[PDB]
Design a protein around this ligand. Structure first.
Ligand SMILES: Cc1cc2nc3c(=O)[nH]c(=O)nc-3n(C[C@H](O)[C@H](O)[C@H](O)COP(=O)(O)O)c2cc1C
Ligand SMILES: Cc1cc2nc3c(=O)[nH]c(=O)nc-3n(C[C@H](O)[C@H](O)[C@H](O)COP(=O)(O)O)c2cc1C
Ligand SMILES: COc1ccc2cc(CCc3c(C(=O)O)[nH]c(=O)[nH]c3=O)ccc2c1
Ligand SMILES: COc1ccc2cc(CCc3c(C(=O)O)[nH]c(=O)[nH]c3=O)ccc2c1
Lengths: 313, 313
């Protein structure tokens, strides 16, 4: 009985990894994620220039999840590139580097530079589409013509297999259109579903106040609030993108949540809010929990049940 | 101390009502909602002709909320019109009727007939903008040109104050666009935020199966999962629609939850999943709990704190 997986020409001890933005911003964070029992890690989504992010408080968590408007605080691309080229120990586990440029040109400039390092060291790109573009326009993955533009230009500039981080969708016509766009791009080999559920609003009853400072309290939702949304997106893309891998992300706090993701079609399983709250110890628990469910069901590997969620009739 | 309020030229004993679809499909349901302590009731969204809806199981609830793909089962418009016209006791509480035609034409034909009953009896219209498919087209409220058309035609055909039931949005640009459309229509006097969060997917770990039969298990989410989404949408529209009321819907299980909706800007507060689960007794508890929070804070009226959620700096 086994959590091992081989994909994208890499070997992973188990399907677990951090979600981008969690425990991955500094060299200390990345070392800590590397020392954990996760199967992989991903760096914080980066921009060409270092960024302070939004004013604090900008993240808060509660029994059912989290809200954040971090504003892409990060040490800049040069730092994550150097971590990938010189500091990361690939004998420990694979590394994804997440990029989140504020325009298509900024993305192109980073990918062009990442390419030789990806070719030589095997760092894997995750391009964050659930990201701001021109203000007053929707985020890139909610604007299918911008999304197409970004993927064309990044495919050209990068020329190597990569994946994409997708916001959740809520409408079948959107699942359909989005997957069709992704399916135009053979180099997109994995699709990560989902980013935070956008612009929720948490209000503290005692203080009668929003709980984060940026954007009048509006921010992305993670955690228990979003598991069914996350599972729906995983399975929607799993079903529509048969030549691509899907990575699941949203609401994983237990091996059972991981099991559901995987049933939905997830290959890798990312952990955000629950990891921010519990710390990297969470990975041994998730592994032990998932292996317990497998034992009880008689499953020996992840492929025996990945994507095998049953429907009724 | 009492929770009485006046709006749209009607008096309401308190701000609570059912959410469209819940406990409101049959004469029996409507009579039950009338006998409750609710402040108002709304009928099941109707079509011109009766519908059986989707195959069962089509609704399921869990500790954090519910999923449904009912498929608009209803008795048909003639029945709700007759209820509004001959059966409802307006001395007990106001009635809203929800209409959800599958095209603009169907909507126009229903509202023309409702208009004289609205004039004569005071039944209020809630137009459901939240319907989905025809593979390749988004639900009307996610297609702003269709939405504008529906509201143009309905305002022309109906000619009296009405309200609209909105799905959640997730992106600030969409809030700005959606609100700007709604503000083109002076007869749109209330906006109900929000409908179920679209196309989530609940999977049972034990059976490895989805839990509702229609649409491969995909369906709209209600309950605790959606409270912060619902709060954001209420507040976003309350900010953007200063000449309209906003009615809150989503994740109300307690007086506290209702308090947060009203802080966010809600005038009326609709109860869906929690009402389905607990039954109509829920209304006495919610009134008590909301009055209790008020007394503790020294608030005498809903007006004193409606829309007064605090932001940070
Ligand atoms: C504090 C915080 C920072 C995040 N930053 C990023 C980021 O830089 N890039 C990204 O693609 N997603 C980011 N996310 C989204 C997470 O990667 C994940 O998609 C989301 O939190 C849902 O997973 P969860 O429910 O396990 O939290 C962040 C989330 C949190 C809570
Ligand atoms: C069984 C069921 C049926 C519903 N039917 C309708 C409907 O006919 N029209 C409508 O506008 N909303 C309908 N909804 C959505 C609710 O009115 C409400 O917007 C949603 O459930 C979110 O509120 P809640 O969190 O309190 O469940 C229905 C919800 C459920 C759970
Ligand atoms: C209001 O100023 C803002 C707010 C949010 C922003 C979000 C991003 C994308 C990075 C990201 C973040 C983040 O860094 O805030 N949080 C998430 O939940 N998912 C993400 O993909 C990037 C820039 C952002 C700028
Ligand atoms: C054929 O499959 C479907 C599935 C869902 C449909 C939903 C509507 C709108 C009625 C409605 C329903 C419903 O009746 O399923 N449920 C909600 O949560 N909100 C709604 O507004 C209308 C038609 C629907 C048809």
């Amino acid at each position: 009985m086994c959590l091992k997986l081989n994909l994208l020409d890499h070997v992973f001890a188990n399907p677990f990894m951090n979600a981008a933005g969690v425990l991955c911003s500094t060299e200390e964070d990345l070392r800590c994620m590397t020392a954990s029992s996760s199967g992989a890690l991903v760096s914080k989504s980066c921009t060409s220039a270092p960024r302070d992010g939004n004013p604090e408080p900008r993240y808060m968590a509660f029994p059912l999840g989290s809200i954040n408007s971090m504003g892409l605080p990060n040490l800049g691309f040069d730092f994550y590139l150097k971590y990938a080229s010189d500091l990361h120990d690939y004998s420990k586990k694979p590394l994804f580097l997440s990029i989140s440029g504020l325009s298509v040109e900024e993305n192109v400039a980073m990918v062009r530079r990442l390419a030789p390092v990806a070719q030589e060291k095997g760092v894997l790109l995750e391009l964050n589409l659930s990201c701001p573009n021109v203000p007053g326009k929707p985020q890139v993955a909610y604007d299918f013509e911008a999304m197409r533009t970004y993927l064309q230009q990044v495919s050209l500039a990068y020329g190597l297999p990569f994946g994409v981080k997708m916001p959740p969708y809520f409408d079948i016509a959107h699942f359909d259109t989005a997957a069709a766009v992704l399916n135009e791009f053979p180099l997109v080999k994995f699709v990560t579903c989902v980013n935070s559920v956008g612009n929720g609003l948490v209000i503290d009853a005692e203080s009668e106040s929003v709980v984060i400072k940026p954007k009048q309290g509006f921010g992305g939702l993670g955690g228990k609030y979003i598991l069914p949304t996350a599972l729906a997106n995983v399975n929607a893309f799993y079903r529509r993108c048969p030549d691509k891998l899907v990575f699941g992300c949203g609401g994983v706090y237990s091996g059972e949540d991981a099991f559901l993701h995987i049933l939905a079609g997830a290959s890798m399983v990312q952990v955000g809010t629950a990891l921010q709250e519990e710390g990297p110890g969470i990975f041994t628990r998730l592994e032990d929990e998932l292996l317990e469910i497998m034992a009880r069901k008689g499953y020996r590997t992840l492929e025996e049940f990945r994507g095998r969620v049953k429907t009724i009739e």
